[PDB]
Symmetry: D3
Subunit: 307 residues, 6 copies
Amino acid sequence: HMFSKFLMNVKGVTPRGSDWANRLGPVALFGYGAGMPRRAPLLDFFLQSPRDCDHYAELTIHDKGPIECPPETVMFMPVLNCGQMLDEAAGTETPTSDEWYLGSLEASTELLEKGYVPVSVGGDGSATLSMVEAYKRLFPSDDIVIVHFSARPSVSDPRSPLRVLLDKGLLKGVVSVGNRQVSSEDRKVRKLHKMFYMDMHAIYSKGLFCIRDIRNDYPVFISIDASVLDPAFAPAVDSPVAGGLSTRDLLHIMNGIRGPKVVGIDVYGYNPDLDVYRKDNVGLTAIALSKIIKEGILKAYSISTHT
Amino acid sequence: HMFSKFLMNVKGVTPRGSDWANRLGPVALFGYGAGMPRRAPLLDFFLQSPRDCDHYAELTIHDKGPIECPPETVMFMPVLNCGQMLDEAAGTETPTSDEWYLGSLEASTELLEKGYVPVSVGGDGSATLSMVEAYKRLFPSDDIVIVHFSARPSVSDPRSPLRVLLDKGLLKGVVSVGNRQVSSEDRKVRKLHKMFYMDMHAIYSKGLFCIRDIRNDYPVFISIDASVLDPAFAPAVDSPVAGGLSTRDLLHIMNGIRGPKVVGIDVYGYNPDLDVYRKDNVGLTAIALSKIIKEGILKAYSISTHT
Amino acid sequence: HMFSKFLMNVKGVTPRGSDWANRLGPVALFGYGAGMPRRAPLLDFFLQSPRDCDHYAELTIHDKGPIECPPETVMFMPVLNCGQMLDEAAGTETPTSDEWYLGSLEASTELLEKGYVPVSVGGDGSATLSMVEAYKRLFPSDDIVIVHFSARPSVSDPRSPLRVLLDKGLLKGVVSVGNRQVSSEDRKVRKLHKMFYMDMHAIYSKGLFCIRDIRNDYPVFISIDASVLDPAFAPAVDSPVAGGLSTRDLLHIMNGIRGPKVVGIDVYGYNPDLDVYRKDNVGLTAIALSKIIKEGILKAYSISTHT
Amino acid sequence: HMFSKFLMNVKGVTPRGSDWANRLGPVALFGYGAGMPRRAPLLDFFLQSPRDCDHYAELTIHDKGPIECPPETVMFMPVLNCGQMLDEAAGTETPTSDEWYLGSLEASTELLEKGYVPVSVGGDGSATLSMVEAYKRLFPSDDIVIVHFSARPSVSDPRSPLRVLLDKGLLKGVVSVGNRQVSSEDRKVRKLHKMFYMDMHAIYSKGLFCIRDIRNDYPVFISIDASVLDPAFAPAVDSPVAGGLSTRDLLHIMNGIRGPKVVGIDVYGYNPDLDVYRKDNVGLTAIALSKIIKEGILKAYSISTHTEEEGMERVK
Amino acid sequence: HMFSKFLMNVKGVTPRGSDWANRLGPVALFGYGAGMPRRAPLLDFFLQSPRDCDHYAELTIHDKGPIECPPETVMFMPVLNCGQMLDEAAGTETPTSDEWYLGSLEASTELLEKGYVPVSVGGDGSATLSMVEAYKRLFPSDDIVIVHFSARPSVSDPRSPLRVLLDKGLLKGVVSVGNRQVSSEDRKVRKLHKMFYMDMHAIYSKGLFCIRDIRNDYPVFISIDASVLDPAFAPAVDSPVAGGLSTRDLLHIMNGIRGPKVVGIDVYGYNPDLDVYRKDNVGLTAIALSKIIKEGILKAYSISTHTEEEGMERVK
Amino acid sequence: HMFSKFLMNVKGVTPRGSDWANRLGPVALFGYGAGMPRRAPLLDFFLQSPRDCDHYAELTIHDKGPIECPPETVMFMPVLNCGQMLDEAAGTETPTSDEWYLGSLEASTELLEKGYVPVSVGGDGSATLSMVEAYKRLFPSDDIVIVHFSARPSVSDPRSPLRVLLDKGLLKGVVSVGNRQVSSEDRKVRKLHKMFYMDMHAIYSKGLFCIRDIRNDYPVFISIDASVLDPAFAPAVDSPVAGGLSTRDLLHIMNGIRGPKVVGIDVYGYNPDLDVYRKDNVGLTAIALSKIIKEGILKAYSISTHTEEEGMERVK
């Protein structure tokens, strides 16, 4: 409804240039706000952040096409900024969770068929559900695995984005990283669906930096909940749980993610009303998530299935 | 005096059910406020926190008995909430350090003879002195060792809780973990009483996650000062010292604590007036200490002398 | 101009006692404010901080001489407090970057010829330029190497303190530690001047605590930018970059710095208007940098070329 | 014929008792000499070696049943000594390859149907083909994985035991350990049959005492060629290849073998005429190999699919 | 009698000078052949081996005093060669067990009272019993710990040297290193006398180059059985057990031995008739053992209770 | 004379083709027997050993050219077998030291000018002096570093090959690996010529599989004395020193050798009369050494200055 301006802009996105096949990318970036306050400054804060990555590459942000492939010598990575989905000036009505879903499912379908890798910033994680279904519908043959970073397994509620994808059998497998609050009900669902998981204490006690190897052949959807970070690095989350990952811990682990291609990326769990602020009113979580998004984009451009 | 309501409630606590012998536990929880502001929100914040532990077990909080042993298949851990010692509505008079001592010594004696493991939350660390003496008086034959987590050795002042226990010879040994501010006077007392210590830089440079082994046969009292954490994780401490433990560091190390039983647990050094707050007025230290308390309780239920 | 009171005080500093030759030290401490707000509380906050180091030694702060060598049994380390360079009560005029330079170059020249090791606290890093030139002019034969801790290489701008020293060929070599934002232009300058660097992800993935060895024979200038720390530990920096060093990480690495003597120390990049504050108005970065300064001083007293 | 005395003794073996209900074991031990000199003293030398193992347990060797399942915690491991297959006394004729096969096939078949874990000692590796086919014929349902210790992949030759098992499609998977002489034809067969391998240099550089905890749920056959050991430890092999495992290395690696049960064990590649001998005529390889056989027997009694460790899942 | 020539030479040894004031050493070296063949060439072969050690120091062998305490930093280690105990020339009679004991007891007694650290070479291990009792008789005040390198616990037999020392209550503690053949009766004695042990498989899995820094304050006797080494390195032992230490492994582990001083050293378990020989008749075990004896002597000159490292305390 | 047949065959070698444009190789292999018994079978035994290497590549031995540069990805490594230097058939006179030198000097000179990497097998180490001087005479511009594997520094004697090269100032640097017998005169020469060294105990304690990634840009000569290996792996050396590298250890360490190219390789210190033999008269050292020669040849074909890893610089 007030996604309409955002939706029509994605509809007219110039399709993948014919030199982007046999090539990872390009990356399509947009803002997602489901379950979060209307004022969502994370996407804009990212666009303001420096574009030099941890690895020796640089993001190139374009508000509109044409998005064309550069030489692999200069190593630039084009990002098409599709902006916020919610037109914050088109009204005061709050979109229902079903409206967020439909709008997200439509934007993902469009960006994927156009040949872009969709990267959603913000929201409560419901975006994961919509753009995984969008890929599965467009490519029913492909097997999808989800690498999910969170403090919680988030598969307790049958209406959870991860739980819905599992019950509908759209996922080949699930990799849960950094859980540190696991209920018995979570364990039952983990057993039933046979999920692979590495809880926080397990990662720590077995060399946190000693994570590099093991081969994965299936296209990967990367779902990142901000709560996977320790509250000292990411306070702006609902019901924080201490003893989590550092920002550098998270970057290292996600750098070791293997696969033939990235299905999509979801960064979420961020609430500006819960953040810790510097005296100049900049939030800690925004700073942390800004670099996570960047290295997520780089991963979408450089992911390999085995080394 | 205004501990009277709290004290009479402990007096009527139903003694250990006859299926709790040959069994670790149960755990008795109460609030302690000596040397700290009257508004002590840490205990209440803990009771509000999620009860799923790092390990696959769950705390079960009861305000009153009966506290009975469940099957070891369901793995529940009963915690008897005895509430705050200081009746914050009974007056405006501040209890002296001697009154805090007497009240704490009486509550500990009662909870121990009832068959409970006492866990004290809050205060300045003086609670350590009182419930160690309460155990020693009730069990003069048993040898007690203290595992003490702090940024400082805290044995300089002859009136320090740790120093008093040492001079009175109630301790078999002392394990100081994570010191990073050691005076020459501290070193003299460490030499005289032959304390085992692993300073912060020593822990770090010799594999922080490489701490697991070595056998201990003596019942352990766990004394945890919040200052042992780095100020980035626990700012709410008097005279903070940078370069400390992360929350995950602390959880890992305390998980490796060995012994036949836990004498008692002291979590302290927390001042709400010194904390760093999120925009929704929740303090970082409260979040950190909330999980430390939980895994301390779990340790009291699962501690083993050697593996 | 309003450095005049500070400058005349350094002019009358009692020269190195004749028992300080064949001996590392003493250390001269002063405040530097170039490129930063006039209210610079870092130096005063350090002087207020505890003086017990990580290692079993203690700083002894003297506002005036005589600064004489104590026995190596008591292990005291004299620090001559020269106070803030900018007389915050002498006027409202802001010194130009050229005035900061001249004033700093003059104070360094004086403190060095007096036999002191200069330690500058605060500013934007321009102090590095002035006291390295002061040493080179006084000792043209000696070869100088810089160990530089920063999130950025800071050699992009031809007017950067590090870049100027390089182009003028006053440095034997450059060790950049903890970069995590490297532009292509940075890489070109790193290649041209043949700088040794260990970027953040490289340090982390190859055992962060596994850094100890390798021999260095050249006198070392230690330049520390606060941005090298993760924003969770040091938020008070311009344009923060997540995924940085912890305070303990930094202390460990700098402890492994080898050399025959310390040329000088620069701690900078701190802006009180950008810090995260506790409820009692103490900044996190100030706490972190306070201990970095202390162990920097200790390094100036105990540095060795190889073990 | 040559195997007559041995076979009829194997027939009369009283099947394992009901006391072994859902229990690993027991183990049946016999000599196998295909492709090797007539004097095959490795079996005799093992039966003379100490019974105490690395881990705290004791071998108990028996020539005849009943094989009593010991009290739950005494840590005894009964072994049924079935003796030598070839009876050198009766006859002077060397069995053909196919005769060795049929002999090993029937012996393995009988012991398996009686509920024994067969452990073959000696030979050139042809035993691996026989007893794996004996198990697969008796239990077509079970999926078998082979852990193969050797200096060579031993699948280049179309007539090789392992290559035959793979071409017949009788194996779920193959784990080759300690190869250090791999031909191009080997590598062509490796990808063709998708077999897992950890070459010798790869084991060494990635911490020899750091071999993973991958969970295996398929019954394991353990095929051990002596050539996997360095010639300094096991010189009694044809065409020795330097740069191999130490006996300690091998014991550690085989101790990490995972599975619900062992389908069978084959220890081979030993030739007395190629050994290095002490002044009292005891060979070094035989010393090393008797230790290998013993810990192989212990593995058959205590193998497990994985070590359950809370907080982390296990890759299959 | 048989020990007559050796004993009277030991008697005439000029006691260590005053220059050794509060100093480790010196070391007295002698041959000991109890339980072993008459030709015992290990001592002669050691005296022929190079003097330069692993760590930068040089052995200086002497047959007669005075043994001058070298300048503080020249890194010379004087060794007093006391020769063979049994004189094969004088007489053809084999000494009984008790005669070996009394001979070793008196020799050890004399060298200790003269201020020498006794290093015995050869025999079956009976020397450990003698010189430990010689030290304990001379210094009842001192508490002794024994570090025992062997493939076997060697305390099952009530008549075993180590078992006798434990039953007589002459030891503060015992550290058994490298066991890989442990019987149930052994384990019963181990808990009964509360002896510390690190079996071979435990040493290997937990990083062989990762043995701890536990502080020891008691004087150490070092009892070294050659069987602790793998048969590939030391085949000249009775009943060899595969899967042992390399010579390098052993040198590293014994280099980590802590203590105020060494009470004595015994290197045994070597039999020339069981060795593996090169074409020029040099045995492998003798090569390995001479290196072991040398680094044992160096240990006696430079042993320390602990390495003081700031920030962390040391477990006793 | 003695080298007549060998030399004139070396002269007629057709120089490497233009297909080797900016390419490592090819390798020329020849026997060298200075200081050793007349029967020198190490070369023959290597030419009989399997061609397949540790890493996936295959040796292809040739007696005569043309040596065709193989397709870019077939992983063949052509080796030119130049045979034995000394022709035992023609004449019964032992060459003097200087005659060995001149023979090796001219052979090395010819092969280098033809664009071959010379690999010498056998001798006492004198070959190192010859071919390094042959390279330095042909390429005075290039700075050479020597990687020297030995149990001894081998620079005490003023007449030692390495000491001569250092005194003549023909080397940029020297990396001594695996020393375990270092005299005081050695240490005096070490600081005097500022040579880098990693002694055996230092390699072991600091993780044997943990040797660094230091970048080297100078052409490397690889001088390999068999004594660097433990006597259990290589007993056929003069005055054996226990506590050395395993064959595996050595292969790993030499695989980490960095450089733009190999100037030459010398494998020596082997004496058939000092070896330990199997019952079929095959020596253990020869087995180990043929593996060493093979991986040395592979190193000459695939050596690199450093592994470029993003984010961290390399110490030169």
